[PDB]
Amino acid sequence: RIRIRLKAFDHRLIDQATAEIVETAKRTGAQVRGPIPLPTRKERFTVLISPHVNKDARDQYEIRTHLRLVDIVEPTEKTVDALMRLDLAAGVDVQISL
Amino acid sequence: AKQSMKAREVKRVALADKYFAKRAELKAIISDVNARWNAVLKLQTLPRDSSPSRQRNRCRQTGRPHGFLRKFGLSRIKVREAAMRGEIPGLKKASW
Amino acid sequence: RRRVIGQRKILPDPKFGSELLAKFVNILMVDGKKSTAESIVYSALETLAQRSGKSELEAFEVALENVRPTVEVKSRRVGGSTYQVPVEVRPVRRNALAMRWIVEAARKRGDKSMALRLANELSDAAENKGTAVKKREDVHRMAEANKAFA
Amino acid sequence: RSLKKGPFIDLHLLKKVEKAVESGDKKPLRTWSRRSTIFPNMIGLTIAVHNGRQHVPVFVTDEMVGHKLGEFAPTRTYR
Amino acid sequence: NQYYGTGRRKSSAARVFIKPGNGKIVINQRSLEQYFGRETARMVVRQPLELVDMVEKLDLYITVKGGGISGQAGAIRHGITRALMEYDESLRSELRKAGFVTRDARQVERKKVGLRKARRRPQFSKR
Amino acid sequence: ARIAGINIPDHKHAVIALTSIYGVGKTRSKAILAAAGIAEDVKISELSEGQIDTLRDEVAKFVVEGDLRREISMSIKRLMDLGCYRGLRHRRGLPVRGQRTKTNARTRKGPRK
RNA sequence: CGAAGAACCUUACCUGGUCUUGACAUCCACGGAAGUUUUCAGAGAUGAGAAUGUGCCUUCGGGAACCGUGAGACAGGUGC
RNA sequence: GGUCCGGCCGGGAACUCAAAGGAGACUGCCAGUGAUAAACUGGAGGAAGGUGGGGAUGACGUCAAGUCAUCAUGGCCCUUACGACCAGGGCUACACACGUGCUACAAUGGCGCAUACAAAGAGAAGCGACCUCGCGAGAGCAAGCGGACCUCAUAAAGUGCGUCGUAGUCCGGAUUGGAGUCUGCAACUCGACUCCAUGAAGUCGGAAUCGCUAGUAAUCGUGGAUCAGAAUGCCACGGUG
RNA sequence: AAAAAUGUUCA
Known part of the structure; x- marks a missing residue:
């Protein structure tokens, strides 16, 4: 029903401080979904570390940007009060659906 | 730097849209x-003015094209530094 | 060096049951790939089978273990004088080397296909058309007749 | 390169041409521009096309089935 | 199904449900030589099966995904005898020392900056 | 065979035999044979002279041979008359179509020392 | 190799058009809402125009933004 | 179980996968060896032993190494200008020489047919299916997706068959002619792509010279960045080996 | 235990 997309950088953030909305939603809603993974949409760069020549040294970058989305699904539409106005979180893509 | 080379570059983007x-x-x-009709055609080749194909994306702290990254909107070193x-x-x- | 360095063991050919046959595909390895190699192996194998209802495997074996390499020249110290020492070859490495050579010898016989090569080529056992006879007349020529020591 | 699906006109300096075909040309137009389709009907003129330091008079030739000004001027000079 | 096996070898992981039934290899509604063209590969993974002789007496379904051609067959070879260490725990030793629950770790290595491949570097000359 | 005039290669399939021999190349080879309903993999060893009648007609709908070879040279010299970038360039035979004008020009400009 | 893209433009180089508190900075004074759509000539830069808009606050003077002009202290220089 | 037979439907979370948190390896045990010393060599068990495999980490320092043009800056210098703004041209000459690459010379191959299995990224002025036309490049028409949904998307060597026969050819592809597509106001110098025609040199390379110790070399594709629009370049990914 | 020179001035 509802899609709940949690998309944040660190595992110390997509997993931590994110339980506070799963909590409050139990009473108001009627179900919870646990934290379901997703194939993680990630990057890696290369920037030439030198200011001039020397391509033997380039700084090679990586960047996991984790995706456990949780994705609580609710036919119960009384969830919304304690879900979204009440609780708050930043550093994490918070997205809701019908 | 070269303040002067930069200054130019900026104003192209106003007229651009x-x-x-x-x-x-x-x-x-x-x-x-799709089709052709020389009337309209030759009078919309008539203005040229500013153009984004005459604009490079540029670094917003150098304005060189070499080693550019769209992705951060800045050049080589002006990524690596940060x-x-x-x-x-x-x-x-x-x-x- | 200070360690004897080799690598993993290759698998024996699984549809004739024979490691030698699989190590000769490797010799013929084309595009980096065993596949297009195995074709021709098998093509010329049959050629040999027709002329030789009995094993056609003992015309590889005889030819190449008649040839017994032994020569190189090195040097080591002995009693405070170095001396130019001639050195023998160990009987195992004689084997290991010899199997390769005959099959190396193909793709230069100026045929159309590796059929006509490896077929006519391999069949001989001591009257070789392969490099095996052609190294005989150098190995024993050298040894102990222009080699001052074992 | 190509005029695409149906043609272009390739306007580049088409503000002088309409003045100079009302008494003809015979006189060397100081022109920086090096592009514009020379039309087979715009002939008998004297174009001084640029090469970046000298404008050289070039008398237009008949039957120009699709060409540029640029192709008829020096670009860099040999030994 | 009554015995399961993983076996993930050469980037291909293959499900194994060994079912009760009779010797046959049914894999994606086909056989080996039917899910692939000419193969050397087909013989190699039957090698544990003749090792003490099986597949005349049970049936199996396999669902291999991804990786290689040989890599797929890598997975098949791996998972069958990770489901035949649990059919038989007496051949537990005779499968680990016969290197069939041994994972192949010769896996393709990554490219670097300033190198053409994993170790390859440019040639230099001057003549 | 020959078509009717000028030899082309013999004892070889018909697509082969048509060759590149001025305005009839690879594409034109099998397209022509397909067109006149004669079989493509008919050797001149296997080539009939009832096949021969329908042949000649389809190659006459293209400017081929000596005829072709005029027009072309008239047009390479065209561009020079103009004195085009392509034009003048042909007087020492310098690359026109893609190729370096500095170097690497062995087979257009001629070779190194 | 610097340069993970040299048409013009970029790009420093060149030839030409053109300017000198300035293209880019701050501050002071003057004039003017900012702007809007448009004409002619020029390669364009621009130069010279035609109409149109009369905003934001006011303590009604004054300001706030911004445009043009004036003037220097200054400014500019991928120059060594 | 159902099935439009298609994980197409419910359904079950087992399973692969996903991805957060763990289990494990410690010469730890077993024998021998060793100054009874440290320690070493075999053995076992295990997915993995004796710096397991692959990254990332360059000491005190040296090279007045490079880089005032990435940027920062001491001094020096230019000041109706070594300043500034614009249009055109150049940076894609060429008479040679060299570096770094790419492509072939062929049947262990080339071509025609059908066919097998991948991994990892990309993305709302965005990717653009579809369906229509276009031989074609591509143009029209237009859905879908904020992308474990939809689009880019279609792996290629490989495989079974058809053939050609070791010819500079059916190899190879340069050169050039003519006609087109597309990005851009616009492609003449100096943009990329396609159609046809023309069809090269090269018959596996001297003296000499280089890398690479294992999934390495080898080989076959694939994607991404950059980028209005220019990869035989760079960066990254797997298949085979 | 396999022949072999030579290095403009200046921190």
């Missing part, structure tokens, strides 16, 4: 590859 882009893009069928100091979330050294 204020006297061009939807002023110019007004071509429709009769002036593209990135080494650990200012930017989650960029890290390759280590897999």
Whole structure:
């Protein structure tokens, strides 16, 4: 029903401080979904570390940007009060659906 | 730096979507590859003005084209500088 | 060096049951790939089978273990004087080397296909058309007749 | 390169041409421009096309089935 | 199904449900030589099966995904005898020392900056 | 065979035999044979002279041979008359179509020392 | 190799058009809402125009933004 | 179980996968060896032993190494200008020489047919299916997706068959002619792509010279960045080996 | 235990 997309950088953030909305939603809603993974949409760069020549040294970058989305699904539409106005979180893509 | 070289570059972007882009893009069928009609055609080749194909994306702290990254909107070094100091979330050294 | 360095063991040919046959595909390895190699192996194998209802495997074996390499020249110290020492070859490495050579010898016989090569080529056992006879007349020529020591 | 699906006109300096075909040309137009289709009907003129330091008079030739000004001027000079 | 096996070898992981029934290899509604063209590969993974002789007496379904051609067959070879260490725990030793629950770790290595491949570097000359 | 005039290669399939021999190349080879309903993999060893009648007609709908070879040279010299970038360039035979004008020009400009 | 893209433009180089508190900075004074759509000539830069808009606050003077002009202290220089 | 037979439907979370948190390896045990010393060599068990495999980490320092043009800056210098703004041209000459690459010379191959299995990224002025036309490049028409949904998307060597026969050819592809597509106001110098025609040199390379120790070399594709629009370049990914 | 020179001035 509802899609709940949690998309944040660190595992110390997509997993931590994110339980506070799963909590409050139990009473108001009627179900919870646990934290379901997703194939993680990630990057890696290369920037030439030198200011001039020397391509033997380039700084090679990586960047996991984790995706456990949780994705609580609710036919119960009384969830919304304690879900979204009440609780708050930043550093994490918070997205809701019908 | 070279303040002067930069200054130029800036103003091209104002006109780029204020006297061009939807002023110019007004071509429709009769002036593209769909169809042709020389009337309209030759009088919308008539203004040239500013153009984004005469604009490079540029670094916003150098304005050189060499070693450019769209992705951060800045050049080679003006990524690496920030990135080494650990200012930017989650960029890290390759280590897999 | 200070360690004897080799690598993993290759698998024996699984549809004739024979490691030698699989190590000769490797010799013929074309595009980096065993596949297009195995074809021709098998093509010329049959050629040999027709002329030789009995084993056609003992015309590889005889030819190449008649040839017994032994020569190189090195030097080591002995009693405070170095001396130019001639050195023998160990009987195992004689084997290991010899199997390769005959099959190396193909793709230069100026045929159309590796059929006509490896077929006519391999069949001989002591009257070789392969490099095996052609190294005989150098190995024993050298040894102990222009080699001052074992 | 190509005029695409149906043709272009390739306007580049088409503000002088309409003045100079009302008494003809015979006189060397100081022209920076190096592009514009020379039309087979715009002939008998004297175009001084640029090469970036000298404008050279070039008398247009008949039957120009699709060509540029640029192709008829020096670009860099040999030994 | 009554015995399961993983076996993930050469980037291909293959499900194994060993079912009660009779010797046959049914894999994606086909056989080996039917899910692939000419193969050397087909013989190699039957090698544990003749090792003490089976597949005349039970049936199996396999669902291999991804990786190689040989890599797929890598997975098949791996998972069958990770489901035949649990059919038989007496051949537990005779499968680990016969290198069939041994994972192949010769896996393709990554490219680097300033190098053409994993170790390859440019040639230099001057003549 | 020959078509009717000028030899072409013999004892070889018909697509082969048509060759590149001025305005009839690879594409034109099998397209022509397909067109006149004669079989493509008919050797001149296997080539009939009832096949021969329908042949000649389809190659007459293209400017081929000596005829072709005029027009072309008239047009390479065309561009020079103009004195085109392509034009003048042909007087020492310098690359026109893609190729370096500095170097690497062995087979257009001629070779190194 | 610097340069993970040299048409013009970029790009420093060149030839030409053109300017000198300035293209880019700050501050002071003057004039003017900012702007809007348009004409002619020029390669364009621009130069010279035609109409049109009369905003934001006011303590009604005054300001706030911004445009043009004036003037220097200054400014500019991928120059060594 | 159902099935439009298609994980197409419910359904079950087992399973692969996903990805957060763990289990494990410690010469730890077993024998021998060793100054009874440290320690070493075999053995076992295990997915993995004796710096397991692959990254990332360059000491005190040296090279007045490079880089005032990435940027920062001491001094020096230019000041109706070594300043500034614009249009055109150049940076894609060429008479040679060299570096770094790419492509072939062929049947262990080339071509025609059908066919097998991948991994990892990309993305709302965005990717653009579809369906229509276009031989074709591609143009039209237009859905879908904020992308473990939809689009880019279609792996290629490989495989079974058809053939050609070791010819500079059916190899190879340069050169050039003519006609087109597309990005851009616009492609003449100096943009990329396609159609046809023309069809090269090269018959596996001297003296000499280089890399690479294992999934390495080898080989076959694939994607990404850059980028209005220019990869035989760079960066990254797997298949085979 | 396999022949072999030579290095403009200046921190």
